[PDB]
Design a protein around this ligand. Sequence first.
Ligand SMILES: Nc1ncnc2c1ncn2[C@@H]1O[C@H](CSCc2cc(C(=O)O)cc(-c3ccc(O)cc3)c2)[C@@H](O)[C@H]1O
Ligand SMILES: [Zn+2]
Ligand SMILES: [Zn+2]
Lengths: 115, 298
Amino acid sequence: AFAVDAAKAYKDYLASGGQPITNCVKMLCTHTGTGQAITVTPEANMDQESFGGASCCLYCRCHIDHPNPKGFCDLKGKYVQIPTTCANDPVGFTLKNTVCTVCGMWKGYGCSCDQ
Amino acid sequence: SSQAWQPGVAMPNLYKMQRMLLEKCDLQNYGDSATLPKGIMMNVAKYTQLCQYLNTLTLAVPYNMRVIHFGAGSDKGVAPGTAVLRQWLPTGTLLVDSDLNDFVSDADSTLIGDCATVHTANKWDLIISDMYDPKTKNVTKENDSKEGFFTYICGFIQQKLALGGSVAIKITEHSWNADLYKLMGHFAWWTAFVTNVNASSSEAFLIGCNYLGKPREQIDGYVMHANYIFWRNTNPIQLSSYSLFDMSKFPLKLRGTAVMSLKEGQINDMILSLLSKGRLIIRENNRVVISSDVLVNN
Ligand SMILES: Nc1ncnc2c1ncn2[C@@H]1O[C@H](CSCc2cc(C(=O)O)cc(-c3ccc(O)cc3)c2)[C@@H](O)[C@H]1O
Ligand SMILES: [Zn+2]
Ligand SMILES: [Zn+2]
């Protein structure tokens, strides 16, 4: 029944005041994009930075297995938009937040379906 | 330097025609740095300016474009250049990258190990190499043509580059190869391109544009590298990151270039002309299959 829980292990090391994973690959872009969370090319808006997806995935970066039956990674080969105020920890951000299934923005940082 | 607003500077044609002898490279602006946009890394800026320059050439851009990228890992285990190439290339382009050392990548597929262990069934439309061995930069001894990975690269161009395809291969003062220069004469056009963000370094990309599979031009590789060093020695390039701030026209244009499969007897001067203007790719269009050799021992 044993499984290693790396997501929980990284959140716990952030909580105790640990230095976030570095060297996520930040892209040059117009910063006039749609602002959606995970896209096929950089889509940062004025408030976002764009990163290459693989470099922002905990499982890719730690060389461990992705937590689903298929084994697949939904960041690798794409670009992830991070709010500029959170860009010091893109791995932490993607791990902790959720993408809206209807509008494609981050729940809580751009999704407007709830009012 | 109206050059400061370009992505970089290409070796002018009159320097290509010289017969200089090899000198030591001594760059005026050595040790200067460009000021990069906040939090942007040198290899993102470098590959962006390289792609911006490639946007001005007659690259063939088919549907099902196939690009392979050698020397793509960083000492931090990611692939910044590969991320820029995926941004630049049309959505759906097949991108394979490789490096001696383990790294995680945005490429469709990645092979780890010495590049000589890499085999591919298919041919490619564009080959990018960043491979560099820092042991070559020993100033204390004679600057002869280097082999290592350059021997693989020349073989790979001759055997696995589609006609009409293009290459961009990193060189420096000491990391260079005479046969690779000779091969530049097998394209319709060639240059040595220096990015403005890294203009304080002797690195350049040897860019072959539209491969013809035969000598259009006879090039002595020892003379041409001497000519390249002469150009660099007498033409200081002002460091500049200006072109990084305007990305509105960055993506490679989807030209829908035609792909045809032809036995080599059918390559006439009319085919050659279409190759030469970036209007034709010649290769098959089967499945892309790659592999890595594994040595077994105790
Ligand atoms: N035969 C091969 N097959 C497959 N891949 C290969 C092969 N040969 C090289 N590479 C790969 O090319 C990629 C780009 S080298 C970038 C670089 C630039 C500079 C510089 O000028 O400042 C200094 C160093 C350096 C310094 C100290 C070290 O200890 C190691 C490196 C490295 C690397 O990731 C290499 O692994
Ligand atoms: Zn992943
Ligand atoms: Zn929504």
